A paper describes a structure:
The coronavirus 3C-like protease (3CLpro), also known as main protease (Mpro), plays a crucial role in processing two polyproteins (pp1a and pp1ab) encoded by the virus RNA genome. Inhibiting the catalytic activity of 3CLpro has been proven to be an effective strategy to block coronavirus replication. In this study, we have identified mutations in SARS-CoV-2 3CLpro that confer resistance to WU-04. To understand how these mutations affect the WU-04 sensitivity and the catalytic activity of 3CLpro, we solved the crystal structures of these mutants and aligned them with the crystal structure of the WT 3CLpro.
Residue numbers in the entry:
A (entry chain B), B (entry chain A): 1 to 306
Write the structure that this text describes.
């Protein structure tokens, strides 16, 4: 019983975190086999960030200009390259603790675990969701760039996020492990503002299903609605449109509770129109949208197959 | 920037989780040096739990009656003993991944990270607070008994909780690593109900300070109160009494915000009597009490020493 925001165990990722220093700037890198991945803006001075030419700065740098330290051992850089916004430093030593890994690009609305690190040392782990405006609301202090977001798919650690930037609103922006930013953000000091955000509708419904599984049933009603007329209310309250694919994803939760997805939509409609009536749902007085349907299944297994 | 519920990296604890099997019952154990710690109720059948005499059941058990598995490797048990409510199985082999560790007994209101495990394999990590009624609001499924709570204070893992049981209200109860239950709970099927809970006042204030640091200022007022007049309202809404020790602990946050602790108490006073009027504080519509002042300082460091 119980439902909590839960991150994946970070051990396999901790064994890959290193410290990368170029000039006066120090951040975190991801050491997989004989390659260290880190944000390319480490090669920039404070003045370079105003208008950096990364192709020029990369040529000007030498292998010895990059100091990579895995804890107490210094790793010798023997090659440096750039894939989009990520710097790739080939090192002398292959990481003996490299896990089975993949590079994946997640979609807005999906969640992952963030291992916040400083000086190449992990500091904390928490779950984050890619918002529709392609930002994440994490907790980062100075020296956190290079921290990675990941999911564990049983035996494979799928890295999906590398932390690059903090926006003026306090939210955070970064790239996938191929150097491609999530959203329209660039790794330079220019006027970039996160777009207006929306609520992840399919995540709210899955979160309501988790409540029903854990005994919270006051918000349930006898009403049913159609996908079209629910999406009308959803747009009226800045909710993402609900698609048939989203309904299919919610299939398992609807199967174990016996509550049709459109019946939960009728309950969600009334909650949006009349509020929460001063009550709470899974320890929240707001509708939570940072739990994916799989995230719910992870903590709410059915009784169908025990 | 940002403020999130953040757990410690679980790697050092992941390397200590093992599987302990007695008869048909399988749960998790903590492998430190040559001793495996697990809940003693693993030696009970389903009928035994109704009225177990653990001293007798231990006599009937042999070393070979306990099957301990460190992942895929079977550990040879060479001794079984009982320290209060925890079973201690001495094994032939010392765990090479044992970190610098201590056993500590935490206070109500203090927080720790829970590494939820199943069949000796870590599944997730999240932050929990010891409630005043000596329960925790975690997320546990079948086979989670033996999961441990911990804090890391620079290379040292302080174990403070082992999960034993779920109460009828859905909350969870367990012991320290010396086998002493938190609260008046016993490892037997009896009429045991968690007492009525109260809100951790010093944690709410620290959380309100974190909100001010992160830009939330609407709940602030020019009102002032005394510790006596605040505690009258606190008891009136089932809040823990605020002591002078609690006020001193909040000293750094009050200095960093320029808000006197008793002025924040006045803000909490008005928030308790009339609510938040449809606004939010750090993305919550409730007053959060699972963040200790140290947890806030950890995520909101001052500029005094840069």
């Amino acid at each position: 019983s119980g439902f909590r925001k839960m991150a994946f165990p970070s051990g396999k990722v901790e064994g890959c975190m290193v410290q990368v220093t170029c000039g006066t700037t120090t951040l975190n890198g991801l050491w997989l086999d004989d390659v260290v991945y880190c944000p390319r803006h480490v090669i920039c001075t404070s003045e370079d960030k105003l208008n950096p030419n990364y192709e020029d700065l990369l040529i000007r740098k030498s292998n010895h200009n990059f100091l990579v330290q895995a804890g107490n051992v210094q790793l010798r850089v023997i090659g440096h390259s750039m894939q989009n916004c990520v710097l790739k430093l080939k090192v002398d030593t292959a990481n003996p603790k490299t896990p089975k890994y993949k590079f994946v690009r997640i979609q807005p609305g999906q969640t992952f675990s963030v291992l916040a690190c400083y000086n190449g040392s992990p500091s904390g782990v928490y779950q984050c969701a890619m918002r529709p405006n392609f930002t994440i609301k994490g907790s980062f202090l100075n020296g956190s760039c290079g921290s990675v977001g990941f999911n564990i798919d049983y035996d494979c650690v799928s890295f999906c996020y590398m932390h690059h930037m903090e926006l003026p609103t306090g939210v955070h922006a970064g790239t996938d492990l191929e150097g491609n930013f999530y959203g329209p953000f660039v790794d330079r000091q220019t006027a970039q503002a996160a777009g207006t955000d929306t609520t992840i509708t399919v995540n709210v419904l899955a979160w309501l299903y988790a409540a029903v599984i854990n005994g919270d049933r006051w918000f349930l009603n006898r009403f049913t609605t159609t996908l079209n007329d629910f999406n009308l209310v959803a747009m009226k309250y800045n909710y993402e449109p609900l698609t048939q694919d989203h309904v299919d994803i919610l299939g398992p939760l609807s199967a174990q509770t016996g509550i049709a997805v459109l019946d939960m939509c009728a309950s969600l409609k009334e909650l949006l129109q009349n509020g929460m009536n001063g009550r709470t749902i899974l320890g929240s007085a707001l509708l939570e949208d940072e739990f994916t349907p799989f995230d719910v299944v992870r903590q709410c297994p059915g009784v169908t197959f025990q």
